[PDB]
Amino acid sequence: EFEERIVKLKRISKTTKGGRNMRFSVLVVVGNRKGKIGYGIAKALEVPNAIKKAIKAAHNSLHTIEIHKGSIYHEVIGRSGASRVLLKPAPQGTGIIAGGAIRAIIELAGYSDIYTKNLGRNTPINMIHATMDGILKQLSPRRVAILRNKNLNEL
RNA sequence: UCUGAGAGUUUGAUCCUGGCUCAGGAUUAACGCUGGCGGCAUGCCUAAUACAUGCAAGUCGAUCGAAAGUAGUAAU
Ligand SMILES: [Mg+2]
Ligand SMILES: [Mg+2]
Ligand SMILES: [Mg+2]
């Protein structure tokens, strides 16, 4: 049940020897709401083929996401170009405090309660890149225990 | 035990810097349209401009002389 949702449908174009070639570009986010989510941007002369190619790319590039108590473990800032997205853990009940591309990414990934803020640009592809970078840079509290020879997150 | 949502807009199309605008609240508010009632609360932000009129700090005869009125033949 890999649900998908459309984030942006731009109308890009080039110029030829007389006239303009117009193609639709779609930014699709595919997620199973259990820990797998990817993104795919595709261009085609028509919306259906563009959506098909974007879904194919999103399913080709899937990333693994780990959740702690339905939320993100520690506060992080994802950077990608001029877009910086701040994610912050939330207690169970606040729900998704995200809006737009971040909200799409978080819901399709499976997180329940996240605090988010877009501190930079508002271009959906770069916001998605920053969000994915922030979630991917995350550290589990068992990898750090293995690294520092602590006792499975014990004090 | 706190705790933060964004979008539109420069280009044939894209990224960034960057300004403008909107989505939310609030008032000692005013205006247009309309208008049934009750519980609380507020009501010259301007001319510290000028004011008709009527009220807004008096009380004590158990401090004191006197005076007036009502009763009483008088004293009282
Ligand atoms: Mg020619
Ligand atoms: Mg234009
Ligand atoms: Mg005044």
Swiss-Prot record:
GO BP annotations listed: translation
Cellular component terms per the entry's GO annotation: small ribosomal subunit
Keywords in alphabetical order: Ribonucleoprotein, Ribosomal protein, RNA-binding, rRNA-binding
Keyword Ribosomal protein: yes
GO function terms (MF aspect): rRNA binding; structural constituent of ribosome
Location of the S5 DRBM domain: 2-65
Family: Belongs to the universal ribosomal protein uS5 family.
Function according to Swiss-Prot or TrEMBL: With S4 and S12 plays an important role in translational accuracy. Located at the back of the 30S subunit body where it stabilizes the conformation of the head with respect to the body.
Free-text comment about domains: The N-terminal domain interacts with the head of the 30S subunit; the C-terminal domain interacts with the body and contacts protein S4. The interaction surface between S4 and S5 is involved in control of translational fidelity.
Subunit structure: Part of the 30S ribosomal subunit. Contacts proteins S4 and S8.
Protein name in UniProt: Small ribosomal subunit protein uS5
Gene from which the chain derives: rpsE
Residues of the full protein shown: 65 to 219 of 219
